[PDB]
């Protein structure tokens, strides 16, 4: 086509989706990770995670307002990945890298798994 | 903070949101523009348009599944802007620029209004 493109559009959309999340506006699911609860937008979760894409395209699970993750999933690891989904920024640290990598593998977030593997290989 | 950032993340999220829209997955509103209907995600509309941000933060309108736009709004102009919201790409042509600019003004999409004004000024 003969379209023009606004370079910052995708980043501005994501910034606004994060603002809606922070104000709990039109959030339609709560992700339960052991004792912790995280409110989010199903569409953002699906757009970022192979696991959520699978869950919310399921004819029964698409209608659930609460999703309980595997008890082995670390809440801090999930929190870091949820922030990444809404911002493109990953708070990767020596003290959380193993939890973040395990959570990204479970959530099926390949690019996060890739950078965790690379940061781990560099420290060995 | 000491975060790392994935450059393509925002663009990949938007690409997936557009794929969900094309398959009518978790769309929660229909925008009626005279004889035409457009299915969309309320959160994407709010993240792109000052008018939709206002509508879906309203305590009554947030719950509506159908939104009827002003009868002066051109369906093709709306279609072009809806595509822009989900892709960052604007199909701006001599034959549609006036309709696109009027629709962007109504929807409160300042960056689109700005490029339409610039393209018009160049042709005079």
């Amino acid at each position: 086509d003969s379209c023009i493109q606004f370079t910052r559009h995708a980043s501005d959309v994501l910034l606004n989706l994060n603002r809606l999340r922070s104000r709990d506006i039109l959030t339609d699911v709560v992700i339960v990770v052991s004792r912790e609860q995280f409110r989010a937008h199903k569409t953002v979760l699906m757009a970022c995670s192979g696991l959520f894409y699978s869950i919310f395209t399921d004819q029964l699970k698409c209608n659930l307002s609460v999703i309980n993750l595997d008890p082995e999933i670390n809440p801090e690891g999930f929190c870091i990945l949820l922030d990444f989904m809404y911002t493109s920024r990953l708070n990767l640290r020596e003290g959380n890298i193993m939890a973040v990598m395990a959570t990204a593998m479970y959530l099926q977030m390949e690019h996060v798994v890739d950078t965790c593997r690379k940061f781990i290989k560099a420290s060995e | 903070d000491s975060c790392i950032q994935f450059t393509r993340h925002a663009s990949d999220v938007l690409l997936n949101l557009n794929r969900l829209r094309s398959r009518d997955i978790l769309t929660d509103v229909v925008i009626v523009v005279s004889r035409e209907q457009f299915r969309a995600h309320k959160t994407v509309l709010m993240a792109c348009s000052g008018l939709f941000y206002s509508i879906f933060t309203d305590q009554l309108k947030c719950n509506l599944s159908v939104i009827n736009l002003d009868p002066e709004i051109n369906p093709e102009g709306f279609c072009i802007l809806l595509d822009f919201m989900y892709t960052s790409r604007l199909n701006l042509r001599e034959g549609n620029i006036m309709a696109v600019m009027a629709t962007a003004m109504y929807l409160q999409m300042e960056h689109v209004v700005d490029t339409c004004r610039k393209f018009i000024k160049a042709s005079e």
Binding site: C3, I4, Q5, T7 | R89, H111, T115
Partner: peptide, 4 residues
């Protein structure tokens, strides 16, 4: 705005 750019030519993509």
């Amino acid at each position: 705005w750019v030519i993509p």
